[PDB]
Symmetry: C2
Subunit: 247 residues, 2 copies
Amino acid sequence: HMSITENTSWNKEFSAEAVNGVFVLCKSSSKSCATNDLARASKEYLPASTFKIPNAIIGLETGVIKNEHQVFKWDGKPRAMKQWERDLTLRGAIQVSAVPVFQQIAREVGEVRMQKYLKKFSYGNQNISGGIDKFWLEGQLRISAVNQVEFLESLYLNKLSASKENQLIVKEALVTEAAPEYLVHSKTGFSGVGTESNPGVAWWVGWVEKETEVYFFAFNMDIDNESKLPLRKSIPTKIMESEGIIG
Amino acid sequence: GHMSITENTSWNKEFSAEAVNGVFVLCKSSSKSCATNDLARASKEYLPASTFKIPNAIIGLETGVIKNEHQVFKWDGKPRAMKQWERDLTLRGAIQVSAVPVFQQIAREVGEVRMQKYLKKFSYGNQNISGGIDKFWLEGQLRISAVNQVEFLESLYLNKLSASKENQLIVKEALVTEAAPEYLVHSKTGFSGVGTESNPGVAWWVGWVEKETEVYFFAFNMDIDNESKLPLRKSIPTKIMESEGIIG
């Protein structure tokens, strides 16, 4: 039931950085949304690590993740990043995007249960081909910025088809900034750089609570150069600032 | 309970540096490994003041007085004692700004029977709700020790209070006060006032800190007769926790 308005003035912040991307920003609910580009707002892309939000929920729901206090122990074998070579809580693994932890969660969940949950969450094209431990990173799964906002709003409201306690558990894991009347839940993603004009995708999704208001957001951008990765926070921040939400 | 606690009087340095009489209780992992500057004061019961918004919020949710985590507590536009309270507030907002009148109305609606029931179920201090339903934690007879605060918070952390897990989770997110990728603080302050002649008020800071895969539970109180000393309720514990390598 999304109601969305195109506002091409937001394109300034992309064009100033020679970047192609979309920002969707909704006030209170998906009935009051704006975007710089309607067409791209509905275009589906590889979720990358933004898929740890659904994956954590499904883990809890299935019993793969035993409870909120579980520690994912590092077996000691090297990993693609330093940051990942250590024991991690659920929140820690999410916050540092510890892919290998979530690969193992995915394996244990299995195709049948994963498929069933992505249908219940209306999560993108509910594809999941590639492999069970890679579909959100290099497989066939795709989701739009619009669909991300709708999924995040359902989570915010405990309306996903999952227990309210599992949704709350995953929510505390997403907190990224906290103040007395200002709270951010958010998740980044990054697929990799890409072969000229087969670029990778970067994401920042989440919600901002300020006084008694809530704002849902999703940003993606084409990225062919890892140096441009911080733009996935600066471009949305700048927009949200010009809208007086922050800054 | 089963607390194991050790007195470490080297911690007194931060108190005597500021001429403060007070206690810090700090536990690693569980209440089976705690330390304090003052074992006697660690067990001494004080008025909770606004630290009582943690049990009160849970009880509000449990009884249905607070309908859910998204309820907005609207200001009627009439003078409130602090400017920071003259606005509509979320549950988190009301906790974070210690909006006494929001919680007073919650307490009245909970009522004496249900309030007494939950304080027993939580083993919350002396469980004495005398003094009036809307002010027993501010000026009445309720009293709780730093030791008991740490045990209550540990139960909350673990979702082991006698309350729904969802209600405990709701109040936990309302208490988050500092967030980083592997470092997270949940906490609450309180301040009873400046007291009377020979009869100081009390100030609190209680909470827990998650760092990597560890958790530390803490409770601080101090005697206070002058509002200008109020920042010490955070600065003293912070320095102790810094010197143990936990933060900063």
